[PDB]
């Protein structure tokens, strides 16, 4: 498993059961009620999936698609973003936006 960083979610990492990203006063929470909520910015944001499934988790894949799956791997929500096979990162930015960047195009070490 990849070590956790408070404001990042790399491809393959999972959030569930009120696990979250934090940056300044902003939070991105994969709540226990199957709702993904951004507490921050001016108005916040939500996936609007309260009660849509049980024991849901959030996972960013290696094509830039961010998905909420329930305990039986039924899709509850998707970012519907899809790109090159590679490594991606979801950043809860200091300015409140949550953005998926990828694929990786340059690295210091292989």
């Amino acid at each position: 498993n990849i070590p956790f960083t408070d404001n990042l979610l790399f491809s393959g990492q999972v959030l569930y059961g009120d696990g979250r990203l934090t940056a300044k006063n902003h939070q991105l929470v994969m709540q226990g009620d199957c709702n993904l909520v951004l507490y921050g910015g001016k108005y916040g944001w939500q996936s609007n999936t309260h009660g849509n499934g049980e024991h849901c988790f959030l996972r960013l894949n290696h094509k830039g698609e961010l998905i909420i799956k329930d305990d039986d791997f039924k899709t509850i929500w998707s970012s519907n973003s899809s790109s090159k096979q590679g490594d991606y990162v979801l950043i809860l930015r200091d300015d409140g936006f949550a953005v998926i960047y990828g694929p990786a195009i340059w690295e210091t070490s292989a």
Binding site: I100, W106, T108
Partner: protein, 109 residues
């Protein structure tokens, strides 16, 4: 600037840091960009004064001196867009991009 990232359009100023755990990326006053404990450096020591790190709209990392002259470039480029140089917790600086999705909690509509 993020504590552990640099977005295209932002600047990592002279003697500035990006840090993730024991891994410390420093844009030094001797114009060398070093990733402490990550076994990497731009190898541009004494090549300029008041040097800064930037990230182009094509995802290229660039070191420029106080006069604005280029000292080093990552050479790897992609399409015009928004990029992010992130200090990974396993000790590598990685450029990701372009952005493929955004959650906007600011727009009222």
């Amino acid at each position: 600037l993020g504590t552990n990232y640099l977005l295209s359009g932002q600047t990592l100023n002279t003697d500035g840091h990006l840090k993730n755990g024991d891994f410390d990326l420093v844009m030094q006053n001797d114009c060398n960009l070093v990733l402490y404990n990550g076994n990497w450096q731009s190898n541009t020591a004494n090549n300029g004064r008041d040097c800064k790190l930037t990230l182009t709209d094509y995802g290229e990392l660039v070191i420029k001196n106080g006069d604005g002259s280029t000292v080093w470039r990552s050479r790897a480029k992609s399409v015009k867009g928004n990029y992010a140089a992130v200090l990974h917790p396993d000790g590598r600086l990685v450029v990701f991009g372009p952005s493929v999705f955004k959650i906007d909690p600011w727009v009222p509509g």
